[PDB]
Scaffold this active site. Structure first.
Site, mmCIF file in Angstrom:
data_model
loop_
_atom_site.group_PDB
_atom_site.id
_atom_site.type_symbol
_atom_site.label_atom_id
_atom_site.label_comp_id
_atom_site.label_asym_id
_atom_site.label_seq_id
_atom_site.Cartn_x
_atom_site.Cartn_y
_atom_site.Cartn_z
ATOM 1 N N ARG B 154 -62.561 -33.650 56.767
ATOM 2 C CA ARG B 154 -63.129 -34.986 56.617
ATOM 3 C C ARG B 154 -63.125 -35.629 58.007
ATOM 4 O O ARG B 154 -62.356 -35.221 58.880
ATOM 5 C CB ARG B 154 -62.298 -35.798 55.627
ATOM 6 C CG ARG B 154 -62.216 -35.160 54.236
ATOM 7 C CD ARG B 154 -61.245 -35.912 53.348
ATOM 8 N NE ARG B 154 -61.028 -35.228 52.081
ATOM 9 C CZ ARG B 154 -60.134 -34.262 51.892
ATOM 10 N NH1 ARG B 154 -59.359 -33.857 52.889
ATOM 11 N NH2 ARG B 154 -60.028 -33.686 50.701
ATOM 12 N N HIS B 270 -69.523 -37.102 55.114
ATOM 13 C CA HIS B 270 -69.159 -36.020 54.197
ATOM 14 C C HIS B 270 -70.228 -34.942 53.999
ATOM 15 O O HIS B 270 -69.993 -33.942 53.305
ATOM 16 C CB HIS B 270 -68.780 -36.614 52.838
ATOM 17 C CG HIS B 270 -67.326 -36.487 52.501
ATOM 18 N ND1 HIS B 270 -66.325 -36.736 53.416
ATOM 19 C CD2 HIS B 270 -66.704 -36.142 51.350
ATOM 20 C CE1 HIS B 270 -65.148 -36.551 52.842
ATOM 21 N NE2 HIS B 270 -65.350 -36.190 51.590
ATOM 22 N N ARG B 273 -69.264 -31.308 54.629
ATOM 23 C CA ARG B 273 -68.240 -30.868 53.701
ATOM 24 C C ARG B 273 -68.915 -30.420 52.403
ATOM 25 O O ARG B 273 -68.724 -29.276 51.969
ATOM 26 C CB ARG B 273 -67.252 -32.003 53.416
ATOM 27 C CG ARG B 273 -66.121 -31.627 52.475
ATOM 28 C CD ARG B 273 -64.947 -32.571 52.648
ATOM 29 N NE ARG B 273 -63.925 -32.381 51.625
ATOM 30 C CZ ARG B 273 -62.860 -31.601 51.771
ATOM 31 N NH1 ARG B 273 -62.678 -30.936 52.898
ATOM 32 N NH2 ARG B 273 -61.978 -31.479 50.785
ATOM 33 N N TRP B 296 -58.772 -27.796 48.876
ATOM 34 C CA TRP B 296 -58.706 -28.249 47.492
ATOM 35 C C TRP B 296 -57.627 -27.457 46.775
ATOM 36 O O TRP B 296 -57.419 -26.278 47.061
ATOM 37 C CB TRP B 296 -60.056 -28.053 46.799
ATOM 38 C CG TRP B 296 -61.127 -28.982 47.305
ATOM 39 C CD1 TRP B 296 -61.139 -30.348 47.226
ATOM 40 C CD2 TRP B 296 -62.353 -28.609 47.952
ATOM 41 N NE1 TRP B 296 -62.299 -30.848 47.780
ATOM 42 C CE2 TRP B 296 -63.061 -29.802 48.233
ATOM 43 C CE3 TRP B 296 -62.924 -27.382 48.321
ATOM 44 C CZ2 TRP B 296 -64.309 -29.802 48.867
ATOM 45 C CZ3 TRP B 296 -64.179 -27.386 48.954
ATOM 46 C CH2 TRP B 296 -64.849 -28.587 49.217
ATOM 47 N N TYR B 305 -67.819 -31.035 43.936
ATOM 48 C CA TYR B 305 -68.577 -31.025 45.184
ATOM 49 C C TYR B 305 -69.846 -30.221 44.999
ATOM 50 O O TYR B 305 -70.818 -30.402 45.723
ATOM 51 C CB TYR B 305 -67.734 -30.443 46.334
ATOM 52 C CG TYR B 305 -66.910 -31.499 47.050
ATOM 53 C CD1 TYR B 305 -65.738 -31.987 46.482
ATOM 54 C CD2 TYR B 305 -67.336 -32.057 48.253
ATOM 55 C CE1 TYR B 305 -65.018 -33.002 47.084
ATOM 56 C CE2 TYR B 305 -66.618 -33.078 48.866
ATOM 57 C CZ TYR B 305 -65.459 -33.550 48.277
ATOM 58 O OH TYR B 305 -64.721 -34.571 48.862
#
Lengths: 322, 322
Positions: B154, B270, B273, B296, B305
């Site tokens: 991040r 983001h 990501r 995660w 996601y």
DNA sequence: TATAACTTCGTATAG
DNA sequence: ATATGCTATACGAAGTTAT
DNA sequence: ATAACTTCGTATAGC
DNA sequence: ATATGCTATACGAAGTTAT
């Protein structure tokens, strides 16, 4: 007494916190509870442990499935937990009965069932039998069975499909913008594509129905005994009717039901999901690609629909057979 | 009461136990809430459930997202709970209306959005273009974008990278040590490896910037208009700035953003990501790997996601057309 | 001096 | 990973309307 | 009358 | 799916400072 009065007031005020389907299920258990109560002479509110225990054993003797019994205790708990009263579940006695009831029933051989598979082989047969029919309702029912098996959509979803959602994608195939999610963190909508054939089937239905005269008309509609469609943008085909098309179609091929009180003796609204899911697995489609088809974010359901497929026998069988 | 004052005093004393952002929102909400109370002549603390309920409906009616409305309720909850006082969510009124607010908003189609994806192709195309720039800014940006996509870190974690955190494999690949992330406060730490190509991009930045002058220097820093990097071991390049790199890069390839005023019209912090997670999924990468990759611990977040990979695959169409 | 390139900050919203 | 529990399907049957 | 639904009530599957 | 509890990003606006 005051505190519960107020808490009841809260609920009806924000009754929208729940779906009408839920409320309907809640009212159904209260009526059941209240009636069993008056009949056995027990105060139905606030419910007492032993009374609830006695009721749950009554539902079991009534031959209800464990999930059904859990649903009765469930709602009963809501009511109490919400109001200022304790939930019967927090009592030793109720906790104990549900436990033994659970295994007693499992011991008896209670199993969760699912829709009878409506597969490609079934679709082919039907398609053949009805392909050349000119009967409006027949044209409708074939298109439905096509969309249902092709898209894996749920009945309430096929019901909501309007004409304005049908777009034309490559090859002329049809595309249906639909919504199959109901959670904040999820996909607002998806687009379902139909094969050349199934698109043709739906093409005939709309041509012989007139649902297209107004884009706001739902794809599927009523067709009276005269074989005359009844388009509309305000009222949609009930899901019971869509279920009817499945049962009726099963009778067409197998005649009257297999009697018994059993469920899933003929096709129902989820039959195409179970069937498409199994053909996809049989064809070796990527497990996730199968999830996309039905809108599953995990493989729990799909694993039940294909549990008996030879492709899912496991390692031990793989080892033993070398 | 005196304990209440005490608990709040304790909370403030150990402010550092919580993130600076948590405090940021705790105060922003209290600002919203206290203004509503004042405008309605009510006591803002302790909050009365019925009051909090009207507040939430006020928020929903102001057109706010469910998540931001749940945020305002969450801060009131923490505040009250940390105070030794009852949480508004403890009351029927508040819990029901929240469920209702969420239900209605979702029913009408609200969905929690997610960053515009920055995938492998977007990176190749960007690199292919910025690759030839000599500007210090361009060399920094390309290296930034490269680490973002390669590591999925991040923007706050990328901005905390110190030159001393960088290592290397005998293969000549860079390894960036990460200690604290949004979801992890550990001394264990993880080593995020960069590809040969990405290590190269990062090397060129270090060389042209001079951040290596002091290992305790943040890997990324500002670059003034004259092309001179301004290293620092006490100030990191703001995350607001890292977001500007993504947005300026997008504007590079596609020009000025839409005028709709909506979010995610251009790449944001983001983007790489979510984009990389989706690339691995597409790639057939196992969940434990994607998990490791993104830091995660749960599988649901990954699917979260991936949430927007849900599109027509043509799996059934291909099955029917054969 | 003007200004690129930030930084700080607050409301809003995702993870 | 499990529940838990809200919400959808199941399905016999009663109510409803236009042939 | 009765096809063809729709509306119910409540069991039970699907998230 | 879901309800904690809470930590992070999104992004326009306005302030800052070496050129």
């Amino acid at each position: 007494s005051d505190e519960v009065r107020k808490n009841l007031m809260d609920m009806f005020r924000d009754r929208q916190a729940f779906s009408e389907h839920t409320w309907k299920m809640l009212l159904s258990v209260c009526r059941s509870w209240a009636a069993w109560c008056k009949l056995n002479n027990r105060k139905w509110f606030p419910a007492e442990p032993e009374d609830v225990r006695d009721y749950l054993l009554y539902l079991q003797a009534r031959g209800l499935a464990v999930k059904t019994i859990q649903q009765h205790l469930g709602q009963l708990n809501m009511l109490h937990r919400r109001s200022g009263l304790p939930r019967p579940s927090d009592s030793n006695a109720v906790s104990l009965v549900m436990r033994r009831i659970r295994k007693e029933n499992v011991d008896a051989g209670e199993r969760a069932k699912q829709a009878l598979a409506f597969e490609r082989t079934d679709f082919d047969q039907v398609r053949s039998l009805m392909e050349n029919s000119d009967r409006c309702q027949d044209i409708r029912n074939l298109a439905f069975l096509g969309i249902a098996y092709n898209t894996l959509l749920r009945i309430a979803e096929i019901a909501r499909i309007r004409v304005k959602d049908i777009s034309r994608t490559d090859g002329g195939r049809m595309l249906i913008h639909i919504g199959r999610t109901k959670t904040l963190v999820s996909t607002a909508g998806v687009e379902k594509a139909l094969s050349l054939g199934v698109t043709k089937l739906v093409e005939r239905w709309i041509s012989v129905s007139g649902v297209a005269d107004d884009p706001n008309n739902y794809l599927f509609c009523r067709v009276r005994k005269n074989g005359v469609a009844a388009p509309s943008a305000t009222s949609q085909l009930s899901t019971r009717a869509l279920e009817g098309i499945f049962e009726a179609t099963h009778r067409l091929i197998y005649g009257a039901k297999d009697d018994s009180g059993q469920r899933y003796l003929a096709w129902s609204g989820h039959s195409a999901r179970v069937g498409a899911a199994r053909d996809m697995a049989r064809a070796g489609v990527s497990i996730p690609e199968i999830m996309q088809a039905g809108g599953w974010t995990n493989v729990n359901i799909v694993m039940n629909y294909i549990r008996n497929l030879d492709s899912e026998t496991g390692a031990m069988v793989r080892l033993l057979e070398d």
